[PDB]
Amino acid sequence: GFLGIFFTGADKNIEKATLYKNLIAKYQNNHFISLIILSALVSDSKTPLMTQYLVGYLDFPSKALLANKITELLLKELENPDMREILGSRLATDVIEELETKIIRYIHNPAGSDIHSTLNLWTAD
Amino acid sequence: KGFLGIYGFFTGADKNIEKATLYKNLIAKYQNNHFISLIILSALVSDSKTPLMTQYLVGYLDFPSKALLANKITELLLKELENPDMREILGSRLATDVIEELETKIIRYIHNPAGSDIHSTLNLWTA
Amino acid sequence: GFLGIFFTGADKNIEKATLYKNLIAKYQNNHFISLIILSALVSDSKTPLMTQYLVGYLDFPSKALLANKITELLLKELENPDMREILGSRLATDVIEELETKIIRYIHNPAGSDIHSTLNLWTA
Amino acid sequence: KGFLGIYGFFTGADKNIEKATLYKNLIAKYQNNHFISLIILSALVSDSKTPLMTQYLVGYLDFPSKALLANKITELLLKELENPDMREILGSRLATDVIEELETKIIRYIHNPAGSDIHSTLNLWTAD
Ligand SMILES: [Mg+2]
Ligand SMILES: [Mg+2]
Ligand SMILES: [Mg+2]
Ligand SMILES: [Mg+2]
Ligand code: NA
Ligand code: NA
Ligand code: NA
Ligand SMILES: [Zn+2]
Ligand SMILES: [Zn+2]
Ligand SMILES: [Zn+2]
Ligand SMILES: [Zn+2]
C-alpha cells in the first residue's frame, strides 16, 4: 500500500508550511478533507521540497503519479458513502478542483478566505 | 474483475458516426503501439463531443464514472511514459504536458480533421 | 498597419470577456504573459466577437494572419535574454500551446483551475 | 540579414537520400510558381523525416529556430494566398485548411509516393 494511512517537520519552508500544517491538524480525522488538503499541497507550486519529500516518502516515481492516486482516492471518496448527498447537481471533478483551488488561494492569501466555512461543509460530525 | 483489458471490442451503434469514424480509424491505425493507442483513448474520453462512446466505455470497463475511468488511463500513461520505456523519446518536458498536448491535438483533429494532420504527430513515437 | 503595444470589453453579454480583461490588467507589467493571454483569447472559440474586433482593429486581413503575428512575437519573446533563461530547454511551440490551453481552462471554469500560481512562474 | 528572399542554391543537407530526391524533383518542377514553392518548403520544414535539411534551411535563412522559420513561411503563404492573386483560385474555402491539406498531401506523398498523385493536386494552382 503506497499510501497506507502524516507529520513532516522536515526542512520546511515559510508561513505556507505552517498554514498547511495547521489545516492538516484540524481535519486530521477527516479523510476526505485530508486528501483534499494534500492534493492542494501537491498541486501547490510553492511547496516543491515538501512535495518531493511526500513523493519519495510515499514511494511514488513522480509528482504526477502521486497527484493521480490522490485524485483517484478523492473520486472514490465521493462515490456515495455519504457525500453523494452533498454532491447533488455538481460533478465530482469541479468540486474537487473547486476545493483544492480555494485551499491554494487561502495558502497564498490567508487574509482573503474563510477556508473553515468552506471545508467544514464536508464534515460529517 | 479486470477494469482495463487490452483486447476487446468497441461498440457499433449511433455514435455521431463521422467523428466516431475518425477515432476508430486512428485506433486501428496505431493498434500496434501500446502507449499511442492509450493516448487515443484518453482524447476520446476527455472529448466532450463523444458522450455516447465514452459512457459505453465507462460502463463496459466497470468504472463508476467518466472521471474514475480517465484517471486510470492517465495513470497507465504516466507509468509507460515517466517510468522509462519511451523516456528516451521523452526529453526535457514533463509527462503531464506531453499527454495533455497529444490529447488536445487529437481532439482538435477530431473537431477539424482538415486543419491538423494528426498522423505525423503520433508517428513521432517509434515502436 | 502593424501590431504594437484601446480595447474595452465587447458589445454582447458574455461574462468570459470579464475574465480575460482582469487577467490582462494584472499581467500588464509582463510583455510575454499578455501576448499569451491574447493568443489564447484569439484561439478561444467562445470569444469570436472580441477576436473579430481585434482582427479589424489591428488591421489584419484575417484571423489566421493575426494569430500568426502573435505566435511570431511569442517565439521571439522566448528568444529574449530573460525569458530564454526561464526556457530551460523546453520547446517554445509546446509551452505556448500548453499555456494557451491552461488559461482557457481557467476561463471556462474559474472556480477551479488555479491560474495565477501557474503564470506567476513566468514573472521574473 | 534578409529573410526569405526566394533563390535557389539549396544544399539538400545529408542523409534520407530518396526523400531528398522526391523533394528536389518537386522543388525543381514548381520553381517558377512562388506559392507552390513555399507550400513544398512548408511540408519540407514540417516533415519530421527531414531534420538535417531543415536545420540547414533554418540556419541558412538566418532563423533562430525551426518554429520561427515555419511561422514566416505560413505568413507569406496566407499573405500570398488570400489577398493578391489567389483569392480567385481560393474561392470560398478557408486559407488555413487549404495550406495544411496541401502540406499534408505533400508529406503523405513523400512518405509513400506510390499512393498519391501530387501533380494533379499541385497543378490546380498554375495558369492563373
Ligand atoms: Mg506542490
Ligand atoms: Mg467523451
Ligand atoms: Mg476567437
Ligand atoms: Mg522537417
Ligand atoms: Na494557521
Ligand atoms: Na487551520
Ligand atoms: Na494580507
Ligand atoms: Zn516547500
Ligand atoms: Zn458519441
Ligand atoms: Zn465574444
Ligand atoms: Zn534530412
Residue numbers in the entry:
A (entry chain A): 369 to 373, 376 to 495
B (entry chain B): 368 to 494
C (entry chain C): 369 to 373, 376 to 494
D (entry chain D): 368 to 495
Paper quotes:
While SidM catalyzes the attachment of adenosine monophosphate (AMP) to Rab1, SidD catalyzes AMP removal from Rab1, a process known as deAMPylation. Inactivation and removal of Rab1 is initiated upon translocation of the effector SidD which deAMPylates Rab1, thereby priming it for inactivation by the L. pneumophila GAP LepB and causing its gradual removal from the LCV 4–6 hours after bacterial uptake. SidD is a protein of 507 amino acids with no significant sequence homology to other entries in the database. Taken together, our data revealed that the CTD mediates localization of SidD to membranes using a dual-binding mode that combines a general membrane-binding determinant in form of the loopCTD with a specificity determinant represented by a helix-turn-helix unit at the C-terminus.
Thus, we focused on obtaining a higher-resolution crystal structure of the CTD alone. The construct encompassing amino acids 350–507 (SidD350-507) crystallized readily and diffracted well. The structure was solved by single-wavelength anomalous diffraction using selenium as the anomalous scatterer. The model was refined to a resolution of 2.5 Å (Rwork 26.4%, Rfree 28.7%) with good stereochemistry. Residues 350–367 and residues 496–507 have been excluded from the final model as they were located in areas of poor-quality electron density and were most likely disordered. The structure of SidD350-507 revealed a compact helical domain where a central helix (α9) forms the hydrophobic core that is surrounded by five helices that are tilted with respect to the central one and form an antiparallel bundle. Despite extensive in silico analyses, we were able to only find domains or regions with weak structural homology to SidD350-507. Automated ion placement in PHENIX.REFINE identified a hexa-coordinated Mg2+ with the classical octahedral geometry formed by the Oδ atoms of T417, T421, the main chain carbonyl oxygens of L411, V412, and D414, and one water molecule. In addition, upon closer inspection of this region we found a second metal ion, which despite not having a recognizable coordination shell, was identified as Zn2+ based on the clear Zn peaks in anomalous difference Fourier maps from data collected at the zinc edge. Given their selective retention during protein production in and purification from E. coli, we cannot exclude the possibility that they contribute to structural stability of SidD or possibly even a yet undefined catalytic activity.
